[PDB]
Amino acid sequence: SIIEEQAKTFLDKFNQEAEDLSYQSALASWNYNTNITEENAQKMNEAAAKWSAFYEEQSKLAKNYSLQEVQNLTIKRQLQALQQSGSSALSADKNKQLNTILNTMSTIYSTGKVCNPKNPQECLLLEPGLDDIMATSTDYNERLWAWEGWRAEVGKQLRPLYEEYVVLKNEMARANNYEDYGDYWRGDYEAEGADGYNYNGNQLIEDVERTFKEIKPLYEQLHAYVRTKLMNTYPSYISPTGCLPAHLLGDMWGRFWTNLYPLTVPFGQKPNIDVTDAMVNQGWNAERIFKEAEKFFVSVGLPYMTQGFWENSMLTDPGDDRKVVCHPTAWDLGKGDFRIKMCTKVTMDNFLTAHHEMGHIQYDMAYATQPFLLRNGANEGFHEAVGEIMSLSAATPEHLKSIGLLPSDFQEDNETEINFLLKQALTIVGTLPFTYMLEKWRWMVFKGDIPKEQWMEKWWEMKREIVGVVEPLPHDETYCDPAALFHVSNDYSFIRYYTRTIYQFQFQEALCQAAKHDGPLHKCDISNSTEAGQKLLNMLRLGKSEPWTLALENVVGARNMDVRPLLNYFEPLSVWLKEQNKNSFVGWNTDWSPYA
Amino acid sequence: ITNLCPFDEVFNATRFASVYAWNRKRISNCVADYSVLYNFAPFFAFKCYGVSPTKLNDLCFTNVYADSFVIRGNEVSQIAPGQTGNIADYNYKLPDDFTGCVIAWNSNKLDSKVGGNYNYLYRLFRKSNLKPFERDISTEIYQAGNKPCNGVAGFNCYFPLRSYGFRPTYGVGHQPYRVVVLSFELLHAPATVCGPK
Ligand SMILES: *[C@@H]1O[C@H](CO)[C@@H](O)[C@H](O)[C@H]1NC(C)=O
Ligand SMILES: *[C@@H]1O[C@H](CO)[C@@H](O)[C@H](O)[C@H]1NC(C)=O
Ligand SMILES: *[C@@H]1O[C@H](CO)[C@@H](O)[C@H](O)[C@H]1NC(C)=O
Ligand SMILES: *[C@@H]1O[C@H](CO)[C@@H](O)[C@H](O)[C@H]1NC(C)=O
Ligand SMILES: *[C@@H]1O[C@H](CO)[C@@H](O)[C@H](O)[C@H]1NC(C)=O
Ligand SMILES: *[C@@H]1O[C@H](CO)[C@@H](O)[C@H](O)[C@H]1NC(C)=O
Ligand SMILES: [Zn+2]
């Protein structure tokens, strides 16, 4: 056609002109982050500003090519990403109003203080003030007042802001031919292609529900075990056949159950596997840690690291008159520039984090030849799923025995395996119903099924049914409990943490059948296996050029998401839990309350 | 041995030309010493066609043409007979029946500055391809739509030349490269370029 050729020329010019601006912004950001100084900030901002302006023009100038007149799919995929305009679909006054609401919510969340009764002279902040109390203490009332103060001091100031936040965002969504803001988030999973490779945003709801109905029984068993273990430390505050109080889950919101390991350890006389002492004794530094990961990656048939990686990356804390941001990150600055920022210490957790980040770097290098606007992960869950499987494979007591950190005559008992699986369960399985419930509530609130006058009732009626958590004190319609979470009050999607967990295990299974592995799935090492690496690189090199269904099929063999590998991973623990819960009740009821 | 050819002011020049304005030098009436040529950099590319790579200094030709320019790293493969792309379609074309050598090496330490080197240009749009060994240095505005452009840039009206902007922290495939193409011709005339005796 005629429009297609013009679109091709326009995309050629855009690709030529966008790389330079994006690279300049990335370099400015890197220089600011690794070297904190006032005038290093201003330049950063300036760079970012220009980029925005450039984009904000092209997204308009690209709306003049009708999308239905373009027939070849790659051009359509590149043009659709450019045509999508977000907050620019509104007028100036409403955009300013939305921005001033968002800034106010973020500021309220950041600087919030809960003042302890009993001589209220020393008030505590959020990050190093209440996380310690809710992760280390074992006092009922001490946890109760910290839990209630955060909702009565920060949750009650975010209700009127949230109410109009919702109204503004629904109008912004309908300005882009949608139904609500929930549809705007669910449209990230849209896929268009051949017959059988298509995907809408309405099938995500059904897939999530279908997966949760299968995941539920294992969560019930773990729930029963944790309930019967928490009665030894809180005797009179827990019912044997009821729910669990909210402020007794080792976290401020109950998102993660890791901090319950000291109280729920199966066998306390057998310690976990730690190799820090061996690492310090033999003599190790950051460079050795980062080279023993490159060996792992080139074992399976993947490229070496670029020379510029070893010169332009900060792998240690400078330890001088220079201030740096100490948070691991992998940077893809563009134009063949790959870097890693990380303060490395000689510990096992850093040893695993190195693998996690080099997974991101290897993923980025695979699709560097793809055109711009098609140079990201297949969806918002593939990028961490690649990193996590490498960490899983590089921590088994057979890979450590090969690199020499364990004695050659080390035999593993069955008591340590149960402990390892329980620790993994407390952080993987215990966060899935929470995410499901939160996202379901937000979707219903956005679409209109939950009226404004019934918000907290639905909250603490869904939490007592889907999850199994009961509130300690009554909460009327003056509070806003969900707003007390970082992601809810900062415009962040939350379902990406649910899909990723489903994806990773699938990947692992497909990479353990190709490696010719015989045994339980939680003892799989994909090192010294070339077919596994080739099969993974079959998917790594696509990017967004193809629908994510084809990318999933290229590595797994199925066009959708399933939970069978996750249940296969946790099978010995399931058997042990069933054996250990004979004289106990599996389940809960929604009628018992601590306050009544 | 008293008339060595001037290959030293073709490889050791202090400033190379852009791809769309490639520089051509004609060499005739001298003795060619194709052995100092090996004394330079590791020569990322020393590939050549129709001529034995080790017995060049055995045959006589009537003219030797040297073409010099600077391209990117992932474009050297486009300097070859019978290839399609961007450099080989709008900038520099080699005939299918080619007899000569192609030499290409790295120049990151010389043609790359902090902030960007914007002195090197290449053509991005053209109405038709190039016949082999042809040059275009026009700067009229490319017209992509039915609307007549009328000497002004805008919608469906693009300036045909763009820049590289080399920086030292780029990858190998985006770093500067210097390319010299040697073309030997043998026409009906006395042969005047030969190797040392
Ligand atoms: C950090 O930034 C300052 C400018 O404020 C600069 O002078 C200094 O050289 C930078 N640090 C390094 C290691 O280059
Ligand atoms: C391009 O789009 C703008 C709106 O942003 C419009 O005013 C202009 O007429 C369009 N140009 C065309 C259709 O040639
Ligand atoms: C679509 O465009 C791409 C450009 O990346 C091209 O390679 C391809 O041949 C075109 N046609 C089809 C059917 O993909
Ligand atoms: C992988 O192959 C290397 C090379 O022989 C060998 O030393 C090593 O023990 C093998 N296994 C692992 C887990 O590295
Ligand atoms: C571990 O193996 C021993 C060896 O027979 C067995 O007696 C014990 O019951 C096993 N424990 C678990 C938790 O599997
Ligand atoms: C360029 O000059 C250097 C040193 O002057 C040396 O490599 C040689 O003389 C020249 N190289 C070539 C290929 O002529
Ligand atoms: Zn990560």
Residue numbers in the entry:
A (entry chain A): 19 to 614
B (entry chain B): 332 to 528
What do the study authors state?
To unravel the underlying molecular mechanism of the S proteins of Omicron BA.2, BA.2.12.1, BA.2.75, and BA.4/5 bound to hACE2, we determined their atomic structures of the S (BA.2, BA.2.12.1 or BA.4/5) or RBD (BA.2.75) in complex with hACE2 by cryo-EM or X-ray crystallography.
As for hamster, it is susceptible to SARS-CoV-2 infection. Compared with hACE2, H34 is replaced by Q34 in ghACE2, mACE2 and RatACE2. In patch 2, residues Y449, R498, T500, Y501, and G502 of BA. Therefore, it seems that more polar interactions are occurring in ghACE2/BA. Given that Q493 has a relatively shorter side chain than R493, R493Q substitution may weaken interactions between R493 of BA.
